[PDB]
Amino acid sequence: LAEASQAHTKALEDAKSEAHRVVEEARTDAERIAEQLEAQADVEAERIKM
Amino acid sequence: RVRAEQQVASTLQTAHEQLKRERDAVELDLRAHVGTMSATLASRILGVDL
């Protein structure tokens, strides 16, 4: 039971760390997608200006 | 998008009347040059300067 409890707390803390590592890539790809959209903005504007 | 296309519609609203002003301004100018064109057309149809 000692081993099971320590394994539970270890897996719990690793799960939280992995949650953080994952939301990291989440927000990174989110800012990248926003950047791509703002980039499409100027070209879609110029395509109408011209 | 909608900003760009509505403001280029505004630029069209301006350019239409501007170019129409240019057109009816040159309409009175071209009338001075009709005589020479008429004379040369008649000369080419007939074959003499008159």
Coordinates of C-alpha atoms in Angstrom, one line a residue:
Chain A
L1 CA 0.0 0.0 0.0
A2 CA 2.9 2.3 0.6
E3 CA 4.2 1.7 -2.9
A4 CA 0.8 2.1 -4.4
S5 CA 0.3 5.4 -2.6
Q6 CA 3.6 6.8 -3.7
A7 CA 3.0 5.5 -7.3
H8 CA -0.3 7.3 -7.2
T9 CA 1.2 10.6 -6.2
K10 CA 4.0 10.2 -8.7
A11 CA 1.6 9.5 -11.5
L12 CA -0.6 12.4 -10.4
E13 CA 2.3 14.9 -10.5
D14 CA 3.5 13.6 -13.8
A15 CA 0.0 13.9 -15.2
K16 CA -0.2 17.5 -14.1
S17 CA 3.3 18.2 -15.6
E18 CA 2.2 16.6 -18.9
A19 CA -1.0 18.6 -18.8
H20 CA 1.1 21.8 -18.6
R21 CA 3.5 20.5 -21.4
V22 CA 0.5 19.9 -23.6
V23 CA -1.3 23.2 -23.1
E24 CA 2.1 24.8 -23.8
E25 CA 2.1 23.4 -27.4
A26 CA -1.6 24.3 -27.4
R27 CA -1.1 28.0 -26.9
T28 CA 1.9 28.0 -29.2
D29 CA 0.0 26.6 -32.1
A30 CA -2.9 28.9 -31.2
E31 CA -0.7 32.0 -31.6
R32 CA 0.8 30.5 -34.8
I33 CA -2.7 30.0 -36.2
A34 CA -3.7 33.5 -35.3
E35 CA -0.6 34.7 -37.0
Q36 CA -1.5 32.8 -40.2
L37 CA -4.9 34.3 -40.2
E38 CA -3.7 37.9 -39.7
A39 CA -1.3 37.1 -42.6
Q40 CA -4.1 36.0 -44.8
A41 CA -5.8 39.3 -43.9
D42 CA -3.5 41.6 -45.8
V43 CA -3.4 39.4 -49.0
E44 CA -7.2 39.1 -49.0
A45 CA -7.4 42.9 -48.7
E46 CA -4.9 43.5 -51.5
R47 CA -6.7 41.0 -53.7
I48 CA -9.7 43.3 -53.6
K49 CA -7.8 46.6 -53.7
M50 CA -6.2 45.5 -57.0
Chain B
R1 CA -12.5 42.1 -46.0
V2 CA -15.7 44.1 -45.6
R3 CA -13.7 47.2 -44.7
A4 CA -11.5 46.9 -47.8
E5 CA -14.4 46.3 -50.2
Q6 CA -16.6 49.0 -48.9
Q7 CA -13.8 51.5 -49.0
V8 CA -12.9 50.6 -52.5
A9 CA -16.5 51.0 -53.3
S10 CA -16.1 54.5 -52.0
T11 CA -13.0 55.0 -54.2
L12 CA -15.2 53.9 -57.1
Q13 CA -17.9 56.4 -56.0
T14 CA -15.3 59.1 -56.3
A15 CA -13.5 57.9 -59.4
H16 CA -16.7 57.5 -61.5
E17 CA -17.7 61.2 -61.2
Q18 CA -14.0 62.3 -61.4
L19 CA -13.5 60.5 -64.7
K20 CA -16.9 61.6 -66.0
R21 CA -15.8 65.2 -65.3
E22 CA -12.6 64.5 -67.3
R23 CA -14.7 63.0 -70.1
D24 CA -17.1 65.9 -70.5
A25 CA -14.2 68.3 -70.2
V26 CA -12.4 66.7 -73.1
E27 CA -15.6 66.4 -75.1
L28 CA -15.4 70.1 -75.8
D29 CA -11.7 69.9 -76.6
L30 CA -12.0 67.2 -79.2
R31 CA -14.5 69.2 -81.2
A32 CA -11.6 71.5 -82.3
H33 CA -9.8 68.6 -84.0
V34 CA -12.8 67.2 -85.9
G35 CA -12.2 69.5 -88.9
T36 CA -8.8 68.1 -89.8
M37 CA -10.0 64.6 -89.5
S38 CA -13.0 65.3 -91.7
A39 CA -10.8 67.0 -94.3
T40 CA -8.3 64.1 -94.5
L41 CA -11.1 61.5 -94.6
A42 CA -12.6 63.3 -97.6
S43 CA -9.2 63.6 -99.2
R44 CA -8.6 59.9 -98.8
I45 CA -12.1 59.0 -100.1
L46 CA -11.6 61.1 -103.2
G47 CA -7.9 61.2 -103.7
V48 CA -7.2 65.0 -103.9
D49 CA -6.4 67.5 -101.2
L50 CA -9.8 69.2 -101.4

